[PDB]
Design a protein that fits this description.
Chain lengths: 57, 477
Amino acid sequence: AGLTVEDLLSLRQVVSGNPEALAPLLENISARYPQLREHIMANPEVFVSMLLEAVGD
Amino acid sequence: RNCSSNEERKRRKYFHMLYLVCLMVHGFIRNEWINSKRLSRKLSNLVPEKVFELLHPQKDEELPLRSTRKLLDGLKKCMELWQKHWKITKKYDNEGLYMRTWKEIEMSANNKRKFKTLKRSDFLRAVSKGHGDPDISVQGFVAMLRACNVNARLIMSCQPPDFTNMKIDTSLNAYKDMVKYPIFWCEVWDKFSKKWITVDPVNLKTIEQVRLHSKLAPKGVACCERNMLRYVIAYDRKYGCRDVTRRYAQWMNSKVRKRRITKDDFGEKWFRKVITALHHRKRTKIDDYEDQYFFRRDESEGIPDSVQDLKNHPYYVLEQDIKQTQIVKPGCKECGYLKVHGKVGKVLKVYAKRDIADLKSARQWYMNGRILKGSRCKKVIAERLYSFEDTELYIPPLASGEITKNTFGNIEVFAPTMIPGNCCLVENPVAIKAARFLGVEFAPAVTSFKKPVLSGIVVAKWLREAIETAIDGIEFI
DNA sequence: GTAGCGCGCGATGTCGAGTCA
DNA sequence: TGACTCGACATCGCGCGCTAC
């Protein structure tokens, strides 16, 4: 249940400042991470927190 | 016909959840950026002493109302001066954050193009210059109120794609029609009347103290194509996140619940996981005052005005939609009538769902882990059925570890209750192989029908660990 | 508020797929 | 393997929401 850090960063960045452009990125990443789907159903709060602390800063 | 596969159905539900989570997180982060201390300090100097004092009125003991009024005048003066600060109001490119069609999505996926990244700096710069679309504008407005130390939420109506839209075409009949109601707006807390004031300084330029009806909730078939009110999320100064839809939904339990993921139980539990994920503070007394408003709102909605809205309603059902296997609980009766629009004089009996009992036969109850005692059947269909209060848990009999089982040497386990107290259930295709190889004293578990199903074993708990080891070593048998 | 008026909106039915027992 | 479900699209008559007083 996991993802690189280059995708988690770009995704935080779209989600934060350009969410109009979400659609193709999510298509891509969902096509590159099948398991993400069932993850999101079971444990959304983890994926959330991952998107919140790309601020190890 | 125009209908898609159950697979596409399931994808639409998932992608809806995904897109929603992203939207709501964006709300979370943008609300962070709103709190920026460097920006706040610059925006504060926009607000004269007179208005500032109006925004923080003195407690008036004899008539709290007059304090509320001063705040309203303050809020109105702020809206006005914000109109003046915001010099450049852009148009949303394309559709902004309004709801999009499955076709539109699929096609945006396809075409990748080039997208100018934004980030946090560029946002700040925009708000200070006064350049942006209405979303930026309102968001800035909330920043300003916050720099004046008012309790000012950011409200976001999240518009994910509709997971209740089953059609394979998905095509609509206008820009003016999309922008009629806002995606973003503001609430402000009245300590005197203990209520949240709704404020939309950019689109409707009004201030309302919503009681039962709100100007902000979109109306008319054309306008709702791109704005379908489902999730109204409130973010506060201290990084709260609260679902405030009930303020803004006239029919929450009827109309709106059919269009939210929360209509089944899996949906609700998932949604609550995300809100809690986004709610980074602890409960205050204001939270309680709000919950009280929502409760009263939730109990004043009542029966809807149409048959379609009484399908699968959380609280209510027409007498005609009561299932063959349901009855009216003794000494209850109709709770209301529904005049049926467009049939003269035709009236229907509405029952409350709490006055309806679900009945099951003896086997069906056993299959929920319940047995019956000397009761009476409530209805026959030809097999006698019984109410839930006619019934009782089944406690199956509990040294060496032989379990008394059904005639076939298995155990019927349709519920955790049905494992004896001193035993454990171990589910695994070869668990019987394991148990047979190391002997012991187990018992096959029948958990469901295909027509039985032995999905695993019931063994005394002391012996569980052994099987787990043998199973782990099954290749060595 | 009222009459004159066109049609939008909700009730009813069927059609196909799917779900529970 | 059968009752019961869910959403689209058709059909259809009401009276709803316009002006224009």
